[PDB]
Structures are given as C-alpha cells and as structure tokens.
Structure 1
Amino acid sequence: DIVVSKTSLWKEMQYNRDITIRFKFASSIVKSGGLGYKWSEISFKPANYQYTYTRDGEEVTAHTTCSVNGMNDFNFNGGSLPTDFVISRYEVIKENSYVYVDYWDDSQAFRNMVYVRSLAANLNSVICTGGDYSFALPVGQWPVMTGGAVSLHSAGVTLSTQFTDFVSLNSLRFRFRLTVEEPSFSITRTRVSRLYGLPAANPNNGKEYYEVAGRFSLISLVPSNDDYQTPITNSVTVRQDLERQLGELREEFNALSQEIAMSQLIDLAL
C-alpha cells in the first residue's frame, strides 16, 4: 500500500491487495399444498459466505454475499390435474443475467472504508455448474432436475454493503457477465430436456463454495489515526409487521389444524 496525503486528523490511502473470493448461492424452494405433485417456486436469494483462508503471516477473514440479477423465469406444466407434476416458476440464469458478489475481509484496507475513489481490479473467470434436485412425489416416480452451467467473467467492481443479522459490511461488489457453458439440463420423468443456463435448483451442487482469485486497488478516505474502529456488528429487529402477520397466521392455522385434532378425535367414539 501507499500514502497519498496527510492532514493531522485524516489521511488518504491507496490500498492494493490480492484476494481469494469464495462465495455460495441460496434458493427458496416452496412446495405447493394439496396432493403434493405441484411445486410453487424456486427463486434465488442473497447468499452469505464467510471463510478463513490462509494467506501470508496472517489468516484472512473474508465475507461475501452472492446475489443475482435479471434472472429468467422458466416453468413446467405437466397437466392441470392433482396428479400432473408442475413447477409453476423456477429461476434460471443466462447471458442476460448478472451475478453480484460483495466482498469484505478483516484487513487493514476495509478498516475504515467509507469513502473510495480510483477503484478498479483485475479478476478471474470461473464456471459454476448445477447438481441434482429430486422432486419427491408421494406415490410414484421422482423427476429430477439436473445439469446447468455458466461461466462468470468480471464486468465491473463497485461499492456495496452486506447486511446480515449479525453484521453490516461496506465492501466491494464484483459485477459479472454470464456465459452459457456446456453441461445442459433436463428434468427426468418429464418431456423437457436440452436447454442452457443455471437453474436455482442446486446451483451449489455439493461444492462448498465457488472460488475466484484476483487483485484490486482503491484510494479510501481513512483517518491518519489508524487506531479507530467503525461499528461493524448488527442487532436487527426489522419488519415487526411480518413477524406479527406470520405469528397471527400460525394462530389461525394451529386453530384449524386443531379444529380437526378435535374432529379427528371426537370420532373415536364407536
């Protein structure tokens, strides 16, 4: 690293570091009720991953959040009957999709990172391939989605912040252009196959994390006095409405569920 200017209280520094970016994915999978043959959704969602890779004379504690943008809405409709398998909507990423990966590590450069300019960085290229996801039907066969794969290539880098129930981290966002790779995908036990992209079924595919190495450089505005600290940990209590709305539902449910647990019992008089 280098120094660029110094006024008593404050300082201007250019941090230049080489990093190892390990990130992961996340997906919400909602099954629909009734018989159990219909699936509601398979969307993507922010995916936090914090690791501790061995560097030089120090073990680098980094944190990432892997987000997705502009994903595509696919679907499968194997019939209008209670028995016809269906996936109302599942997200898949293609060339028109972008992958955002926010990176933050416990080092000196993020120390009091708040104001940055002259920011750029060289990056790798990596290929994330989909695994297997089986749709366990009650009585019958189990159609499994499999395949999917695309490579990501750095487009740009920017300032962002990662919010967890535990911490808030101003970090770097590494935009990504997606390239449809080979391993194409299909659903088994179904009349669909041959089509590219990465579906949100099992994007991680057993792998503990996808990795990308690279380096950057930025000029952050940090105090001359590097014996300071910025509040980093969180304590969140947001969306009380939902908490409530949900708990209220838990109620009506339980009620009805039990409205039965007393109708599915009153009749043990025979």
Structure 2
Amino acid sequence: WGPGETNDSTTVEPVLDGPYQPTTFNPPVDYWMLLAPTAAGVVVEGTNNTDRWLATILVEPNVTSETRSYTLFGTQEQITIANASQTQWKFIDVVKTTQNGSYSQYGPLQSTPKLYAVMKHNGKIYTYNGETPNVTTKYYSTTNYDSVNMTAFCDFYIIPREEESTCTEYINNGLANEDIVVSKTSLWKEMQYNRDITIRFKFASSIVKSGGLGYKWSEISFKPANYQYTYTRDGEEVTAHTTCSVNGMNDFNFNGGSLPTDFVISRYEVIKENSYVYVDYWDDSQAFRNMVYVRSLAANLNSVICTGGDYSFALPVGQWPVMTGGAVSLHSAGVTLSTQFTDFVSLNSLRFRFRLTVEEPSFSITRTRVSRLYGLPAANPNNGKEYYEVAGRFSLISLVPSNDDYQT
C-alpha cells in the first residue's frame, strides 16, 4: 500500500537575481553589488555625507586627456579623464573627503566585459581592479562603513559573497491476438463489510527562499504529508497510516517593486473551490487484506474545518508582515482506488477525495493593500495543530474466497 505519485511545483533557480533600476539604496554587508552599465559616465556614488564622497566613472575606449562636465551628486563639475586603451572601457574612482573638498582619482581598470563589482566589509570598501583576464580586487579603508549608501545610476545586480567563485568568472567573461489461460476455474463469493473509520492527517508545506538580500521569497508551496497513528475500533487496536496531498491550487503572487528592498512573493499556492484535497488511507487490518477486488465503495464521513496559520516573514528592516486568517470546510468527494503494477509487486491506494467550501474569516496581510482574500494559505496550513481528523462509517462490498458451499 501507500505511496502515490502526484508531486509538482519545484523551481530552480535565479542566477542573476533580476535587473534592478537606477536608484539610491543601502545594500547589505557580505554581498557584492555588480554593475554592468550600458552608457558611459557616472555609474555609482557612495556617500557618508561627512567625510566620504566616492564616485565611480566609466570612460569610453579610445578617449584622450580632456575635460568633461559631469553632474556629480546633483552639481556640475569639470572632470579631466584619459584612456590609453583603444577598445577597453576604463573605470576611475574619483573621491573626496569634504563637501567642498578636492576630487582625487584612483584606479584604473581597463576591462572589455564592462563589468565592475563593489562591496563593504569590516571598515573598508572593496572593489574590483587590475586587468583582464587577470582581474583582482583592491580596497579603501573607510570609517562608518555600515551606514554608507550605494546609489547607482545604471542597471545592476546583487550576488552573495559566498558565491565569489561565480562572481570572479562573471567579471572575467560576463553572463498476434490470442487468449491464453493461466489457471483453471476458481471459487469466490461476495462479502459486505460495515465498519467505522477515523482518518487523522496533516498538511505539510515546502518553503524555498529566493537568494538575495532577504526581502523576497521564491516559493511557499504545498507538499504531500504523511502521518502514522494507532487507534481503537471495536476493541481492536489498528495502526493506521495516512498521506494528505492536494491538487488544483491557485497561485497568488505579490510584488512591491523591483528594488532589492521591496517585498516579493513570486508564488504561493492556496486551496479554493476549484481545488481538492486527497487523503490516501491504509492500514494492515484484515478487512483491508481482503479488500483487493472491490465492487463498490461508500462512506458516511463528517465534515472537518481547516484554518490558516500565522507566518512571520523575517525582513531585515520594517514591521514584519503576518499572514493571518482564512479557513475552509471539507466534505468527502467520494473515494478512489488506484493500483500501480511494478515488475515484481503491486502497490495500492485508497484516496478519499475531499472537495472544499470556503467559510469565515477571510485572510489578509497587514501593512499591504492586498487584503480580504479567501482561501487557506500554504504558509502554515496546520495552524499549529498536530493533525486534523475526520471520522465516520465505512461500507465495503468486496470479492473473497468461499467456504462450505457448492450446495444449498
């Protein structure tokens, strides 16, 4: 008995984390900001506003010593620049330490892929430098490293530090027809059973987080959940196993924006009227031993309520949204038998399909305008409970061998 095959909803894998628009933000620590601009000029600025204004500038290839008017932090400034490379773009880091302070150029980096990377760590700003295909990194010590913003005026990505092995190669290279009898005649009769049943089951969810800063998730999906227990019926102790799965779920997604600090749920599934919940039940009882060749199946099962649990999203900053509310009542949508035939043995399953009907209260997510939706979330379907239960009658009509027969 037991294991069916109804799995789904797997996902792999954001590699660049998506293009982010030109904005001013404060990326985290131990994470590399990767710049791959499309037009020359200013690319990124870093400002602490008391003693540190850094500005990285991209000079086109085959540009000689000349002065240009670049708007650095909202004000025009005459910056002198030169590049000996006829084909390779040149990154220069113009820095000052006062509001009216002097601009001083550091670097350069002559690189064909037009890729640059920066990060903050332990009181310094590390950046890429050197030459291709022999690129390396350098650093500049800076006080108050943890409060400096990094404002980009061009598209960029964010890559974790632990994937430095991928960051380096990124910077380097970029992205007849007959009937045969087998046995003689046999002897079987029909036996009708009436028993009682108490199916105990539980939900399980699969939580896969999107790689990046930590503000956005990738997948919060359902997953089949198994359960074992031991219960009494008419004085006999039976050790019953259950396995709950689902189908026909509806995929909701939230997007606060493309900024790396905006909360995004690329997908999370919910059960509604257009869904079902299957409960595969099996035990080692003698009734189930006999129940192989079955003619009819019926059962008078009661209804069960299932509520949504609270899920706290661990954001770096801000008040954590909490998905709360939601609940659905169930009713047995008949029971199906399945028989999977393997090379050497056969496997069975008795799946009680349960249809769904929404009830009160609705679920919501505070501080977020997407509110007052229906359904039971996949974030925490168990609502902190160890199991749900549905109990009732079981009425079976099966085909079994016969004894004390052949006459009246």
Could you tell me the TM-score, scaled by structure 2's length?
A: 0.50
Identity, % of aligned pairs? 100
Is residue 117–residue 220 contact of structure 1 (8 Å, CA) maintained in 2?
yes
C-alpha distance in 1 between matches for 2:341 and 2:335 = 18
Which residue, out of 276, 281, 289, partners 1:98?
276
C-alpha distance in 2 between matches for 1:80 and 1:137 = 16
C-alpha distance in 2 between matches for 1:17 and 1:145 = 41
C-alpha distance in 2 between matches for 1:102 and 1:93 = 18
Secondary structure of the structure 1 residue equivalent to 2:206 = strand
Q: Gaps spanning 5+ residues in structure 2: where?
A: 1-178
Is residue 312–residue 323 contact of structure 2 (8 Å, CA) maintained in 1?
yes
CA 203–190 in structure 1, closer or farther in 2 if over 3 Å, else same:
same
- Structure 1 window deviating more from structure 2 (184-193 vs 215-224): it is 215-224
**CA displacement 1:52-78 (0-9 Å, x = unmatched):** 123332222111111111111111111
CA 75–166 in structure 1, closer or farther in 2 if over 3 Å, else same:
farther
> CA shift at 1:39, angstroms?
0.6
Is residue 196–residue 233 contact of structure 2 (8 Å, CA) maintained in 1?
no
Is residue 2–residue 14 contact of structure 1 (8 Å, CA) maintained in 2?
no
Is residue 363–residue 372 contact of structure 2 (8 Å, CA) maintained in 1?
yes
**CA displacement 1:63-110 (0-9 Å, x = unmatched):** 111111111111111111110011110001111111111111221111
1:165 — aligned with what?
343
Confirm or deny that 1:80 pairs with 2:258: yes
C-alpha distance in 2 between matches for 1:227 and 1:111 = 22
C-alpha distance in 2 between matches for 1:64 and 1:12 = 27
**CA displacement 1:156-208 (0-9 Å, x = unmatched):** 11113699999996242211221111021111332221111111111111111
**CA displacement 1:226-264 (0-9 Å, x = unmatched):** 9999xxxxxxxxxxxxxxxxxxxxxxxxxxxxxxxxxxx
**CA displacement 1:31-63 (0-9 Å, x = unmatched):** 101101111111112111111123332222111
CA 87–162 in structure 1, closer or farther in 2 if over 3 Å, else same:
farther
C-alpha distance in 2 between matches for 1:108 and 1:3 = 30
> CA shift at 1:213, angstroms?
0.7
User: How many pairs does the alignment contain?
Assistant: 229
C-alpha distance in 2 between matches for 1:76 and 1:105 = 42
RMSD: 5.9
**CA displacement 1:132-179 (0-9 Å, x = unmatched):** 011111333321111111001112111136999999962422112211
CA 84–11 in structure 1, closer or farther in 2 if over 3 Å, else same:
same
CA 163–131 in structure 1, closer or farther in 2 if over 3 Å, else same:
farther
C-alpha distance in 1 between matches for 2:343 and 2:387 = 21
> CA shift at 1:113, angstroms?
3.0
C-alpha distance in 2 between matches for 1:128 and 1:219 = 31
- Structure 1 window deviating more from structure 2 (98-107 vs 54-63): it is 54-63
C-alpha distance in 1 between matches for 2:340 and 2:200 = 15
CA 18–153 in structure 1, closer or farther in 2 if over 3 Å, else same:
same
Is residue 125–residue 154 contact of structure 1 (8 Å, CA) maintained in 2?
yes
Q: Gaps spanning 5+ residues in structure 1: where?
A: 230-270
> CA shift at 1:130, angstroms?
0.6
CA 2–37 in structure 1, closer or farther in 2 if over 3 Å, else same:
farther
Is residue 5–residue 11 contact of structure 1 (8 Å, CA) maintained in 2?
no
Is residue 116–residue 219 contact of structure 1 (8 Å, CA) maintained in 2?
yes
2:299 — aligned with what?
121
Is residue 25–residue 47 contact of structure 1 (8 Å, CA) maintained in 2?
yes
Could you say which structure has the higher strand fraction?
A: 2
Is residue 102–residue 161 contact of structure 1 (8 Å, CA) maintained in 2?
no
Is residue 154–residue 174 contact of structure 1 (8 Å, CA) maintained in 2?
yes
Secondary structure of the structure 1 residue equivalent to 2:319 = coil
Is residue 156–residue 176 contact of structure 1 (8 Å, CA) maintained in 2?
yes
CA 36–48 in structure 1, closer or farther in 2 if over 3 Å, else same:
same
- Structure 1 window deviating more from structure 2 (166-175 vs 59-68): it is 166-175
**CA displacement 1:1-44 (0-9 Å, x = unmatched):** 99999997655432321101111111111110110111111111
Confirm or deny that 1:221 pairs with 2:404: no
